[PDB]
Amino acid sequence: IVTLQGVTGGNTFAVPALPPGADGPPRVDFPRSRLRFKEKLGEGQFGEVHLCEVDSPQDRKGHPLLVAVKILRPDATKNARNDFLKEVKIMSRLKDPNIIRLLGVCVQDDPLCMITDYMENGDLNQFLSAHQLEDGPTISYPMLLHVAAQIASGMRYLATLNFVHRDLATRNCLVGENFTIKIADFGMSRNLYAGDYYRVAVLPIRWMAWECILMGKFTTASDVWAFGVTLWEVLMLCRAQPFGQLTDEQVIENAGEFFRDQGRQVYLSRPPACPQGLYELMLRCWSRESEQRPPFSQLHRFLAE
After folding, report:
1. Domain segments of the chain as ranges
2. How far apart are CA 75 and CA 72, in angstroms?
3. Which residues are catalytic?
């Protein structure tokens, strides 16, 4: 019923009817000549996402600035251009330390470009999956909770705006110096994460709540379910895929069992690094009834303290 993929490949947010801006993007277009291509993160139907460096960004500090660049095709239809510009207005509202920010745009010419901040160490799945827990590089358990706490605060902020992410996961959490986290939305565009999506729509079924799969009902409570799975990833140091032993069909089968709720379902097991109390809170995010799932305000309080 619902497609989540945006025009340039990434996933889009579910947003209320937004008042016209009267906050917003920069009034001046970003000089394209200042974008040095580095890599192609992913692609969509009418565009692509690039990683680019920027020299002398005054117009981490000493090194060059990494940025993601959404690029619409020059031959994009008027509907595609309107969709891209809907994404712009949404990303222009995002102003939080743990959320990516719209840094510039290139509208007055072709192709349409969206410049957003990008973190130094790429996404958290690739970075964390190489670490091991302290008794390759190592990470402490307090630093893990520090990562999870930032993700909670990011969603808490999105919750205050009535935004719904609909594709939260470690692959959409960007990491930089000192385990600074910024939530983003590029993973859906990446070949590297195809296994995380089921073709139909193309959906991240392993992170979706049962009502997203069986009714297409995405809400803040369904982002809490995804945050539950994401927290599980972090405490597993991103070593395995959620329900990785199951096929994509068995994952939909399992969603029906969450709905039937007769004990035939299976939940993710407690990660070795996870205390009992944190696992219990993790399980509350997977409650059958949306209302029984914790709010991000309460998740942020537990993880920060």
Report:
1. 32-117, 122-304
2. 8
3. 167
Q: Rounded to whole angstroms, how far apart are CA atoms 129 and 126?
A: 5
CA angle 164, 167, 173 (to 5 degrees): 105
CATH class of 122-304: mainly alpha
User: How many separate helices (H) and strands (E) can be counted in the chain?
Assistant: 8, 11
Residue matched to tokens 């993700």: 151
262 CB contacts (<8 Å, ≥6 apart)? none
H helix intervals, 239-295? 248-260, 276-284
**Do the annotations mark residue 154 as ligand-binding?**
no
Calculate Rg over the CA atoms of the chain. 19
| Solved with | X-ray
CATH 3.30.200.20 is held by the domain 32-117: yes
51: enclosing H helix or E strand: strand 47-54
48 is in an annotated binding site: yes
Strands 132-133 and 138-139: parallel
Instruction: Confirm whether residue 46 is marked as ligand binding.
Output: yes
53 has binding-site annotation: no
Given in angstroms, what resolution was this structure solved at? 2.6
